[PDB]
Here is the input.
Amino acid sequence: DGKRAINYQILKNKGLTPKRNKDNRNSRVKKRKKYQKAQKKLKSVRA
Amino acid sequence: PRAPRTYSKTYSTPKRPYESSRLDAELKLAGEFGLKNKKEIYRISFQLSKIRRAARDLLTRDEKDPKRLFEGNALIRRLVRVGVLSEDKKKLDYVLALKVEDFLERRLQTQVYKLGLAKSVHHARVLITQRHIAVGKQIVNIPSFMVRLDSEKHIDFAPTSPFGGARPGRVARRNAARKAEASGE
Amino acid sequence: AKKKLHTQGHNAKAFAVAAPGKMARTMQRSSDVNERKLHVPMVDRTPEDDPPPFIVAVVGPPGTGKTTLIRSLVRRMTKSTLNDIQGPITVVSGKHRRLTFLECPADDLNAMIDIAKIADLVLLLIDGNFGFEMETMEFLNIAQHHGMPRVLGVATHLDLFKSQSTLRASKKRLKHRFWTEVYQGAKLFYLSGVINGRYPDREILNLSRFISVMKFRPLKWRNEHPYMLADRFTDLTHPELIETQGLQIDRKVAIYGYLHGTPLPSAPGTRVHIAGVGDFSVAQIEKLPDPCPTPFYQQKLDDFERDKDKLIYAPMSDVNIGKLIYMDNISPEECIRRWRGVDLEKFVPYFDTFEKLAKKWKSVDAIKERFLREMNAAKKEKLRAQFEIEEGENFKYDTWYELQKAKISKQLEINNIEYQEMTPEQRQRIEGFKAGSYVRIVFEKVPMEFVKNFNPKFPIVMGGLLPTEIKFGIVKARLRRHRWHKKILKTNDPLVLSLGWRRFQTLPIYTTTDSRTRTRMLKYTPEHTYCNAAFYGPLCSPNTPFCGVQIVANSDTGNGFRIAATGIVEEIDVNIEIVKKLKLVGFPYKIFKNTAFIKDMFSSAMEVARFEGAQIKTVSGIRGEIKRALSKPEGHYRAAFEDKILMSDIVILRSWYPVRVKKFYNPVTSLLLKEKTEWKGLRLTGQIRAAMNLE
RNA sequence: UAUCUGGUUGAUCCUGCCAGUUCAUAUGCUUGUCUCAAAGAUUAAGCCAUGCAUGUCUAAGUAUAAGCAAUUUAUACAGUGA
RNA sequence: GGCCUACCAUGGUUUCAACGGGUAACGGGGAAUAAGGGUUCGAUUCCGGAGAGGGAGCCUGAGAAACGGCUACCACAUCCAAGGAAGGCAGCAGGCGCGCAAAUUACCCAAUCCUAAUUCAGGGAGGUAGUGACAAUAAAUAACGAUACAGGGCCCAUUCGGGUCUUGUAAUUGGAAUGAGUACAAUGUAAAUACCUUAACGAGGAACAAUUGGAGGGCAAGUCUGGUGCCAGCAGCCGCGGUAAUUCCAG
Here is the structure.
């Protein structure tokens, strides 16, 4: 069609964001991937 | 001109913003009970905080004062009701004790994990917010539902959803729509 | 606290506030509201008596339809349905107000850039179903750099949407998106349908009322340059001149319009620029009665003497010492002899002889006017008079902005009581055709292309050029890649840019400053910040913002963003020394400890001698100097470094080679061209390679 | 201006000073879903275009509408009703 | 009832603060703040009072010193044929008050109730939706396996090691799940809209594209400043070429 379209850049209008994780997106995962990461440390501090 | 809709907030935030011990202490809880917020801990601290205040007060009144007897009893039975206060320690000097973990242990989130149907604290989150697991025939999608002793037996998958009969589900059926449309007619 | 308070004459303690809290909390909030009211002080220079029509210019995507939108606004203000609207049209909407609509072309950036310099108020319609197209976004960006007009957006195609819930969400999105482009708190009106060929009266009535109280602010460019919009176009040539010379002539042209902004001086011979044709000059200036007169204005004319049917004007569409001084036949000898009845090169004016002056100036009693119970009173009075003379300037508001604003307001009515005394003959020449005087100014040397290829649908304005602006020097501007535009700009790559009243492509050059010791050219543009730049072209005032584009031909746009470079100008000269860095590389072919023999950097042993003592450095970062031209081979030289150079190492001598600015200049001449879209100028470096198939 | 850490010494202390440490207005950025939903402020109780915000009839005060209606016992009236 | 008048008398209040002045003063229920004692605030959902541009006067009436009543003056201010006539948003909405600012000129009497001659009419009272993160509530942006080496475990260790119980960092992988949204229908509603339901649709990073602040380094044939070589310092959107050009400390 002849009618010109919005670019995804100028729609959301997010310019110059530094690269981020996928895991800030769902907080219940970053809680999971922290505790599962901070349970490996617990096996290393004590037995 | 209409009666105020009343409200109030349900959490309180730490005075000391950056205390490293409290921060590690908080995170471990989050990673244990599948929380997403420091607020989900802030919230409970606040709940506890008033419960403890009530109890402190009641304790100052004479033994067997009517209010104390009446309002203390009430608070104890409310706590035993949901499995926060053990049967033995049923007399409010231990509600004066009572930890945050005792409260977090009773969330529908954690209760689903204890049964093992979810198989994880986080699998327990995702299931709940996704319309599986119920109490009666009544679906519950709130992780903080707080499982009252006599419904613990009734945590189970819902009649709807997969996992509880009903039907597989659009993402699976969509595949069975590529099974019979590729290999057949 | 006991005696500090009592130091002042009034009891300090007695005066206090009943509430500390309310006094203090209210005091901060009131102050914030004020500070907000304060804005930097400006000048209006538009007349209180005869204001021009505030030009309102509908813009937007073409398939929405702005012709039927302007026909549903003029039929509710004058109750007279129009048809096939083309060109600028003036309608009286009120007892003192009378706006002038102007349908832009949507297809032409050559006119879209042109209109935003003059549109006082711009009505922007964005399709509700299609949101914002590129043409809306492109127009908003160009308008902001030149000077922001008052924008009142509207949203056609609102009726189409199937579900009201989805429609409400879409309205919020456009309203929120509009706030970022313009100013937050500004809401675009929505029109439900065009079933009868016009919008609903209730929606239109609100839109007409909202526009009426616009009270547009004064743009900086518009109060420095006399401008006008051409109402009707007229060629005044003999057809016998046409039949003899055979369509080759440049035609004598009379043009008609309303002046604006600042007084266009009435001595014929000021140079003045048609947007999109070229630099012309005025030849004859004449003022005729305006077709549309406000009813309040008409009443005054009727009273002095002692038009209801036509409420709109759309011509393009179908229905003494001083007068003894300023003569040149009189000699200045005769001028004073006519007034009573010498070279300026000597500084002391002509006196009389000291014989005649000493006898005259025996007594000083002629000049004693200029120096500095009843009796007692008189004396006192005299003293008072002298005290005022002795200390008057020293002896003679709450907010500084309000005061310094009185430097403008007192400056306004001291024009007005001055102009009033003149007013019938002297004021007109002094007035010089003041803003809104519907003037008939005629031209000459307008090309044949302009009268042949003309349609009234595109506008034509005049820019009264300042004598600053009339020349051609290389300007020092600074600019960046407009961050919507994808590719970065290249040095020495032509760029159409709208600087002042002119639209033109020139060959810029993008010149950083190596920590303010010189002007080094880059090769590209720093892709997120302003770089200092330079380009040939016309000259302007400093602190003038421009907004330069890429390919403006509508045949070649694509879906990319058109506006590529925005910025202001810093200063202007006629020569900027501009430096490209070159470095001379060399390689060592015999090293020692702390002394190298470096080959093939210099060709002859004489070439080295022009360069000895030069602070050579290497890749590795060690310094040195080059000292003597080695003889027995013709090229090489001995150079002492600070430490042992390797064999694997590459010496580089920094140096500076000056460059030039290519003096190409090309006004766009858009509506001299026949097709009036798709004006194609100089191609980009990448485009020429594809055409010539180079790599 | 209380409470806490931190500082002058090669060190240990105390008095001693300096350094950090809400909920009310504005502004900035951001704003997917449910429910809930308020909405003042230049010491200007300043000024107001336009539209609306006060009208009202039962079996039961007044009907010759040259009003509508017709039938239904109605030649005083009797329905309905401006 | 000194409320007012006539006669007559000389009384009345005051350091236990009269009288006067100030108030960015309507009073109260109350608010915020948490050892206690206090301190500060209340124009503002309820009660009371007062006012309707400013003053005064008054008609009607049970009730007004009424202003969506009248009369006069003052100040504003509109209409005109110049003779005259007319207006009072501190109701609802809406506009101005500066030259740079932000709630809709929408729907209904279905509820709540009020008024009338009255079940019926009227009600911008009030309710409905629309409109900037005032405050408050609930709480997505992902969940699980397999594999490829790497581990720490642990039994053995004369010495290869990996092999099961999983700690998890992985640049190929694997199928499951779900609403954000889009949408038959029914429900909702005065009618709509949303919600609660729910057919059909709707997730792999190149989306259906999480933010807003903060700590820290690195890079150039770059620039600048100082220096007892090659260093020290500031710093670096800028280099040499190049912007349909570069894939580039993956960004």
